[PDB]
Write a protein that binds this ligand. Sequence first.
Ligand SMILES: O=c1ccn([C@@H]2O[C@H](COP(=O)(O)NP(=O)(O)OP(=O)(O)O)[C@@H](O)[C@H]2O)c(=O)[nH]1
Ligand SMILES: CC(=O)N[C@H]1[C@@H](OP(=O)(O)O)O[C@H](CO)[C@@H](O)[C@@H]1O[C@H](C)C(=O)O
Ligand SMILES: [Mg+2]
Ligand SMILES: [Mg+2]
Length: 224
Amino acid sequence: MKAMILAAGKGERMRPLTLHTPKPLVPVAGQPLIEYHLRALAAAGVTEVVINHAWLGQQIEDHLGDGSRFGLSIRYSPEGEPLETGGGIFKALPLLGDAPFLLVNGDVWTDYDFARLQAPLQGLAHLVLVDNPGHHGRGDFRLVGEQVVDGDDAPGTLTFSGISVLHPALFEGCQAGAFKLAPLLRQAMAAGKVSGEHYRGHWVDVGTLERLAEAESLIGERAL
Ligand SMILES: O=c1ccn([C@@H]2O[C@H](COP(=O)(O)NP(=O)(O)OP(=O)(O)O)[C@@H](O)[C@H]2O)c(=O)[nH]1
Ligand SMILES: CC(=O)N[C@H]1[C@@H](OP(=O)(O)O)O[C@H](CO)[C@@H](O)[C@@H]1O[C@H](C)C(=O)O
Ligand SMILES: [Mg+2]
Ligand SMILES: [Mg+2]
């Protein structure tokens, strides 16, 4: 299947790093953050990637080009207005086609094996969930067997990893413009159409300098 990497975020919490460098292109261990995803995706057998962008977008295209150096074919979905995650995915659907695709929040650094998702999967969406960051119980969702439901307090909830397989039909109808992805996932969940899994390996949402350091720390433990 195809993959989409979300890369339209402005990274305001990463400043001043993101003043002249798009977040996707910030180096983590001598390598641009998004290039971990491109290499992982190519290793996992993915050959076609869609990347949306907004903030400093043309720098992303300039740097990655057509993706041939990664053994990929990349298409870009430029966004001129703030579309958010859901609206942005929707805007890119023409490039993705009608088949389920792998969706990867580009801000993430992880050792999750993307090739696990090319196995028989369940529903309109299949979500990779991880331990709640910061040692809290808030999270987003709960996982019962393979079935994902909406979170409830802090007894045993999990956090959405930003790694998933989505069915384009998830966006069936859908307000053409700017909207959120989570709300759509809960309608699917409400209909028993969302499966999931709990990944217990390394995962960092790289949204701050502190998260960047943590990712570097873990990446340095893997090299050894
Ligand atoms: O409108 C958007 C916003 C976010 N995103 C995607 O989700 C990622 C960031 O998610 P984010 O919600 O934290 N936005 P951000 O401005 O980066 O917060 P901050 O770092 O504090 O400035 C971005 O890199 C994209 O991958 C989009 O694709 N579109
Ligand atoms: C689409 C997506 O990846 N959402 C996740 C991403 O959002 P981000 O923090 O990058 O803005 O990382 C968070 C954990 O750090 C999750 O809670 C987000 O999922 C929540 C439920 C959401 O859909 O808004
Ligand atoms: Mg942003
Ligand atoms: Mg982030």
